[PDB]
Amino acid sequence: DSWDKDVYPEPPSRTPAPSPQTSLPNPITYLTKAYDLVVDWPVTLVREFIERQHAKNRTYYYHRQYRRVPDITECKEGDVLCIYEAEMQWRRDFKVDQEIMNIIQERLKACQQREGENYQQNCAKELEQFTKVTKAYQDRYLDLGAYYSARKCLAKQKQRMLEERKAARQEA
Amino acid sequence: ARQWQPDIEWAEQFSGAVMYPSKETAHWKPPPWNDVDIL
Amino acid sequence: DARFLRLMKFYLMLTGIPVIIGITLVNIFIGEAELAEIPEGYIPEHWEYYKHPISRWIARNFY
Amino acid sequence: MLKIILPSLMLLPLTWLSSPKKTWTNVTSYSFLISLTSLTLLWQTDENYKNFSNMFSSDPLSTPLIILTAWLLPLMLMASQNHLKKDNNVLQKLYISMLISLQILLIMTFSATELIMFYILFEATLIPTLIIITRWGNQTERLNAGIYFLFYTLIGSIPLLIALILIQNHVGTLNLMILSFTTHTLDASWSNNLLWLACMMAFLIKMPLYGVHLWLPKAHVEAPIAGSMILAAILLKLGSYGMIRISIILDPLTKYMAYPFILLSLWGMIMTSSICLRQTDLKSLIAYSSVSHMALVIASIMIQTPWSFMGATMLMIAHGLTSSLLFCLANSNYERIHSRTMIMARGLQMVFPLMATWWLMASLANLALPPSINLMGELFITMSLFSWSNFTIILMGINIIITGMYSMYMIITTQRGKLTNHMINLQPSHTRELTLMALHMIPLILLTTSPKLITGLTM
Amino acid sequence: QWQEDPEPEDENVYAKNPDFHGYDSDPVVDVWNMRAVFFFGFSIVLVFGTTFVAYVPDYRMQEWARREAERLVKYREVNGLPIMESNYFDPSKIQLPED
Amino acid sequence: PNINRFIKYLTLFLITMLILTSANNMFQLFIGWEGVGIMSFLLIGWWYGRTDANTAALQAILYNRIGDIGFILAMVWFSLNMNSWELQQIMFSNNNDNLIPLMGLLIAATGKSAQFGLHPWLPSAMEGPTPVSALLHSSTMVVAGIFLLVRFHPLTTNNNFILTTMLCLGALTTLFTAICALTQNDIKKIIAFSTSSQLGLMMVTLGMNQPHLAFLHICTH
Amino acid sequence: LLREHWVHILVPAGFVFGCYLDRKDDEKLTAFRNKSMLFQRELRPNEEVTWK
Amino acid sequence: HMTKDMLPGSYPRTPEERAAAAKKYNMRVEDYEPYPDDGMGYGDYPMLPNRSQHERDPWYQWDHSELRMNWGEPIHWDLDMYIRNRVDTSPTPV
Amino acid sequence: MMNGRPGHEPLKFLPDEARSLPPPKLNDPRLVYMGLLGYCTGLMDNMLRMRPVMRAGLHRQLLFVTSFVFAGYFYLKRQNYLYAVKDHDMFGYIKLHPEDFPEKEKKTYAEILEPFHPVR
Amino acid sequence: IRWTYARSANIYPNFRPTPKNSLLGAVAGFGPLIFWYYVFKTDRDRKERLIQEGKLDRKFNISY
Amino acid sequence: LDLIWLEKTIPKSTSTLHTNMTTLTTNQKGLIKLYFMSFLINIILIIILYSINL
Numbered sequence A: 001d002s003w004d005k006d007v008y009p010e011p012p013s014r015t016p017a018p019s020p021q022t023s024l025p026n027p028i029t030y031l032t033k034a035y036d037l038v039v040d041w042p043v044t045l046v047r048e049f050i051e052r053q054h055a056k057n058r059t060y061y062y063h064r065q066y067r068r069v070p071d072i073t074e075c076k077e078g079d080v081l082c083i084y085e086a087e088m089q090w091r092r093d094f095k096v097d098q099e100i101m102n103i104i105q106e107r108l109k110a111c112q113q114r115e116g117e118n119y120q121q122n123c124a125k126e127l128e129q130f131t132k133v134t135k136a137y138q139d140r141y142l143d144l145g146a147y148y149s150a151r152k153c154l155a156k157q158k159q160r161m162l163e164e165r166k167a168a169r170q171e172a
Numbered sequence B: 001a002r003q004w005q006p007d008i009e010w011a012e013q014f015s016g017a018v019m020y021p022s023k024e025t026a027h028w029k030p031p032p033w034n035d036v037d038i039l
Numbered sequence C: 001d002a003r004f005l006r007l008m009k010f011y012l013m014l015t016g017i018p019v020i021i022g023i024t025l026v027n028i029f030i031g032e033a034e035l036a037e038i039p040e041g042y043i044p045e046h047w048e049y050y051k052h053p054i055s056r057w058i059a060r061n062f063y
Numbered sequence D: 001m002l003k004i005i006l007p008s009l010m011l012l013p014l015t016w017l018s019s020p021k022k023t024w025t026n027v028t029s030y031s032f033l034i035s036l037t038s039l040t041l042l043w044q045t046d047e048n049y050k051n052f053s054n055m056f057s058s059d060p061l062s063t064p065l066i067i068l069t070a071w072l073l074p075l076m077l078m079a080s081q082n083h084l085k086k087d088n089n090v091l092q093k094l095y096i097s098m099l100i101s102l103q104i105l106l107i108m109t110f111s112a113t114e115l116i117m118f119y120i121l122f123e124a125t126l127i128p129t130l131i132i133i134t135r136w137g138n139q140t141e142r143l144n145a146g147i148y149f150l151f152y153t154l155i156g157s158i159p160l161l162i163a164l165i166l167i168q169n170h171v172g173t174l175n176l177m178i179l180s181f182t183t184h185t186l187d188a189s190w191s192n193n194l195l196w197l198a199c200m201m202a203f204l205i206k207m208p209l210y211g212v213h214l215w216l217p218k219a220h221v222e223a224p225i226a227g228s229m230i231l232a233a234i235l236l237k238l239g240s241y242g243m244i245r246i247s248i249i250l251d252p253l254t255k256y257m258a259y260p261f262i263l264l265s266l267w268g269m270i271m272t273s274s275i276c277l278r279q280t281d282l283k284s285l286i287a288y289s290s291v292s293h294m295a296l297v298i299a300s301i302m303i304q305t306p307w308s309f310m311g312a313t314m315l316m317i318a319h320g321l322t323s324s325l326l327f328c329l330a331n332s333n334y335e336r337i338h339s340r341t342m343i344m345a346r347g348l349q350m351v352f353p354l355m356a357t358w359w360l361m362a363s364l365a366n367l368a369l370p371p372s373i374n375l376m377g378e379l380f381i382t383m384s385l386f387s388w389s390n391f392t393i394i395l396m397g398i399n400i401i402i403t404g405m406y407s408m409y410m411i412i413t414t415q416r417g418k419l420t421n422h423m424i425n426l427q428p429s430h431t432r433e434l435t436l437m438a439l440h441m442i443p444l445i446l447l448t449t450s451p452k453l454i455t456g457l458t459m
Numbered sequence E: 001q002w003q004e005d006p007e008p009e010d011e012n013v014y015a016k017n018p019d020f021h022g023y024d025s026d027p028v029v030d031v032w033n034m035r036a037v038f039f040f041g042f043s044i045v046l047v048f049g050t051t052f053v054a055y056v057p058d059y060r061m062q063e064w065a066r067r068e069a070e071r072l073v074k075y076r077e078v079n080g081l082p083i084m085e086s087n088y089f090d091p092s093k094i095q096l097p098e099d
Numbered sequence F: 001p002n003i004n005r006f007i008k009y010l011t012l013f014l015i016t017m018l019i020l021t022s023a024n025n026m027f028q029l030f031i032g033w034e035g036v037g038i039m040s041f042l043l044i045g046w047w048y049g050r051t052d053a054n055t056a057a058l059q060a061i062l063y064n065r066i067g068d069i070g071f072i073l074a075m076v077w078f079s080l081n082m083n084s085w086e087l088q089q090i091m092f093s094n095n096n097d098n099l100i101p102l103m104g105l106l107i108a109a110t111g112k113s114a115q116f117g118l119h120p121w122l123p124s125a126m127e128g129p130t131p132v133s134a135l136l137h138s139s140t141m142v143v144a145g146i147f148l149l150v151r152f153h154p155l156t157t158n159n160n161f162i163l164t165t166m167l168c169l170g171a172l173t174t175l176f177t178a179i180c181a182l183t184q185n186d187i188k189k190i191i192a193f194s195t196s197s198q199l200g201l202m203m204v205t206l207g208m209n210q211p212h213l214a215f216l217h218i219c220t221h
Numbered sequence G: 001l002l003r004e005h006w007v008h009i010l011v012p013a014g015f016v017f018g019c020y021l022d023r024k025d026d027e028k029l030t031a032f033r034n035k036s037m038l039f040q041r042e043l044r045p046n047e048e049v050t051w052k
Numbered sequence H: 001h002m003t004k005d006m007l008p009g010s011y012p013r014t015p016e017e018r019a020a021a022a023k024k025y026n027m028r029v030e031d032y033e034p035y036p037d038d039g040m041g042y043g044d045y046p047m048l049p050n051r052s053q054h055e056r057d058p059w060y061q062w063d064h065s066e067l068r069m070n071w072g073e074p075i076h077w078d079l080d081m082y083i084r085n086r087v088d089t090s091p092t093p094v
Numbered sequence I: 001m002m003n004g005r006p007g008h009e010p011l012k013f014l015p016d017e018a019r020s021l022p023p024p025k026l027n028d029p030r031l032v033y034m035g036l037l038g039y040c041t042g043l044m045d046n047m048l049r050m051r052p053v054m055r056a057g058l059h060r061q062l063l064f065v066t067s068f069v070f071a072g073y074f075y076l077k078r079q080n081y082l083y084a085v086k087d088h089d090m091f092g093y094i095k096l097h098p099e100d101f102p103e104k105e106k107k108t109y110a111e112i113l114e115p116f117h118p119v120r
Numbered sequence J: 001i002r003w004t005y006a007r008s009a010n011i012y013p014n015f016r017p018t019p020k021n022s023l024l025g026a027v028a029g030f031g032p033l034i035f036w037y038y039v040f041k042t043d044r045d046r047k048e049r050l051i052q053e054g055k056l057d058r059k060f061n062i063s064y
Numbered sequence K: 001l002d003l004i005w006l007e008k009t010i011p012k013s014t015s016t017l018h019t020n021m022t023t024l025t026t027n028q029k030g031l032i033k034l035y036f037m038s039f040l041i042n043i044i045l046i047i048i049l050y051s052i053n054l
Ligand SMILES: CCCCCCCCCCCCCCCCCC(=O)OC[C@H](COP(=O)(O)OCCN)OC(=O)CCCCCCCCCCCCCCCCC
Pocket: D035, D039, D042, D063, D064, D065, D067, D068, D071, D317, D361, D362, D364, D365, D369, D371, D372, D373, D443, D444, D445, D446, D447, D448, D449, D450, D453, D454, E045, E046, E049, E050, E051, E053, E054
């Protein structure tokens, strides 16, 4: 249950069979047998005994779910109460919208280690996404200072909603 | 080595009827301690 | 410059090992919890949202 | 946050009431635990700031410091047990109390919601500091140094007093929380262009800027070791903390009203770094090192990019710990040598093997060796500065080369070379001297493992 | 010349008290002023403090956000929604100036 | 009298050198780049008493730090523009400008690998103990500059300008250092100049965009 | 407990007083006790205060 | 302990002052050549030959061995530069 | 300022109207401060007169801690009234002259367009 | 001790403001400080224009 | 630039500006006639300050 395959897609594995063309022994095969017998079995034994001890006393932890409060867009002016609850709701999504971008930073990195010499091509499912996600993060969170606040994203957007309305009108 | 406590000379400046003595002001002399003059 | 270390390497190692015994034995026998779904109205307590047991001991008892 | 504070106040009763022989251990042992209570503030499980109560708050930027302010009082009281052990038993209990009040006041200043609470407590810290520097200062010139430390801060301070009373009338409350969630956008007038300077200048003065930093070299030179630690580790950073919380308002002007300072700081960084290269007094060199590495900070609290800010928060906490470490070891050489001259005392590793390891690690923290928070800090300010203008790397690039040179020169001409023939024989190292150091670096090693805690408000 | 003491010499505290720890001249105070400083200094601040600081859970929510992303990325991708839509405050909410 | 400390620093050097070798994100590459620099400073000047050893150690730090400015510049450019210090993503900057950054790494390599600019500290480094001269002055420390460019050569192939730049300076160092070696009368200093001349040939192959063979010479060298 | 065992209780006591004084502030700032939007819930059975 | 009389003073204007300073600095009165009076601060500090400690006889038992400077001899203004580490003014075969 | 108010008591300390206000809790931090302020006065006196600082005048120490505090309750009782009058006076005017203090309307942040100055 | 005093505490008592000292005492403090301002202003202005007109790529830059 | 130019300009100058200003304002004969006449001047100026701003 460590990682949700659907949030971290891993291409299926295709391995060429072990086709030997020499009577000479392949040292690694023998070494690996040992590693398992000496380094894996011993460890494997301990680990299980861990998880059984864990099972004897098992606990659960949940994931706080935050109800959605009203966003600055709708929030009286000067009402420090409402706006405080609404700058947090954003500063919170400033992070949830940031680990998403952390995953695309990561999912890609793997897709260029898993596909070397083909990264130019095979790994373009992601990089198309790394721009579909970067062109958005750039359009909602970038110009802002270190005092990022929902009022300023509200303005960074709305300075440009003129443009998607002045340019559009302009095209006429 | 001990913190430098002020010597006599550092003290001297604070005497005189005016700290920053002027051209003619310096000519003055400190007021009598008894608050009584000799004239 | 050697009396110092026998004292620094000692009083770190004094309270250090009982900790290391504590982190290891807890992490071994008690263990981190596994994530689950809030069961339709459990309204879990503050301690319930953290993984490591002693990291939710401090939360339940003090915060 | 009254456990980090009330128990602190009670230290004062303990320094006075306690036995003359046992006064030192009661005070040092108890404030070590006072630091342990301070660590509780670090338990932030959500991004919202912990508003303890109306007047007292702690957010990511203040919390990393309050803990440092509480941490150094133990250390300050351990570094001044030697000098100040020649006193009359009532001069000590005054020095110990003075040190205690500094962190009581500094803990509150860093943990204050109302900006003028910052001002009153901000400018109060001068009283305890001036007494520590002037009353116990060894050199003939501390009367002068004290004057410089009081006037440069004071002339800057009254403009801020007028500015903050001014914004209260303009907005209606100096509460940092509200001021943040309220619309205070200056209007780029000629007057506002003055307001901005009024608010930032007082903070820019105690954070030595290239133009007004002469107070810091003079002050740390004759200041006793405890005063020099306080000035470098917590006192100068009071200016940085102020610039972070005050520029929430005056949001529009700093976009164009900062150029003057930014250029003053980056050129200042080079010249301050360079004069370290040939300065005979070791305490002098560390002080200018402090000016340059703080000139980087005023150039990140002004570019105002998320990375700058936490580059700043990383460097301020890190450089604070490193500088003290350097000022603390400088004192250990000064007490045995009896002179501040760098040229004398050559070859110490030959005679003080470990202090030299502490010297080496302190210098590597001073220059940017990479698995250190010190480097992460500069790497980040460097990045943003580059974003502001790609050319900035040239000036922030001459500083890195110079910073390497003076940091190693302190090690090369103080802790290597042939031993000095026969200065007053140098008695071996006390365990206090070495711990006072270990207490500085062991936290530097631990913080570098998990930099997230000192990253600032931005991240 | 005026009257004043001659500069005092600094004692080699290591001549007597050859076990001097640097805190005080008489030996027992010294021992009890390091037995309490290494202890309260290192033994229960650098150790118990680092233990507590290490166990602060999901500091500043960055342990929570690497999951919320994962279910949002899980939910957004499977339902076909853009992973990070390009406007955050919905355009409908925003009444733009009509000029 | 201090054999154990000397062996201790040699392995610390190896740990930093290998970290420099196997570093995915460049922040770790920096940890290695700066890390070997500091321990070289500690080990060139093993015999601290001798001022000559101290002068060489300060020399080495200065030349390395000029190189560090280049790596910081490359790091900062890769911390902006394409955004991650991990090599696996930096390599997605193939079709970008990538000149501001690779010029920075070339500057870093010239300082670390004693190219014609700031070539003198590796001759000066011989003030160190002869074993120190062999493992770090001879192999691991100097090849670090060559290793960095091979790591970043997917980007290097795109920019023709920097490829000939290092082909050119590698070439000048090769002969410049070799001609100096002909008359040097110190045995250790002739070998050291040869260390620089061979790396000059290495630099030349990297300049002719032949990364794999350049690495092959590093191992045989 | 006053043979120098009373000077040792001064600071420990300050913590206690602080804690008490601190929890007092919580009592004062208890409006919006549970009236906040993100965290408004119906008092579960047998609970008269969401946060005390 | 060192009276101002034995510490640097102002530019020696009259010739008796130029011979008084030379005593303070333990020099020969005909070798004290005050740094030029252009008001940049040098004061009375002797203008000693700008030669680095590198070519000070490397065999003689210099009191301060590593600065190759004896005890009492006037120190050079820039000894932080012409020291055995930083700069080398020393004759070169070419 | 507040003098000239209707009903002003020409020389009285705290008019009975101040009875309506809550009495200051004896442990009000302020009165407790006055107490400490007082103890210190006492201790200081002992010091300036060269007496054992804490172990002397234990009667005086009490007079001090108990004089200052006594003064406090009856002062704070008043200053509290004065402030309370200020509101009675202030709030009343806001109403009697309503137009001058109109309740302006604040638009939601959606409507308002605040200029966005990029940091870049 | 005569050297350090001569070098950090006997300087300003022997300062006389001449030419070759104030001209050279202003070129050093304000010269580069004014040089870099027109180096950073021109760059920052070039950058801003390009961003305004829409040319600066700012690609994969999600940080600052 | 450090020491002299940055100490003569900001820290020292402000030292001198005042020092000189106190020297002129505080160098007083102590004679009553002089002082009093200054009271005369004041009355005159204040009379005017009211007059011109009538
Ligand atoms: C707090 C604000 C600032 C306050 C400053 C003064 C505070 C003094 C009093 C308190 C001191 C302790 C508390 C503050 C520091 C806390 C450090 C800490 O808690 O370390 C955490 C670490 C576990 O790591 P973790 O937190 O899980 O990291 C997150 C990974 N996602 O726990 C550990 O594993 C500890 C491991 C110890 C051994 C580390 C060995 C590696 C060292 C690498 C050094 C690299 C080179 C450093 C160079 C420095 C310059 C020369």
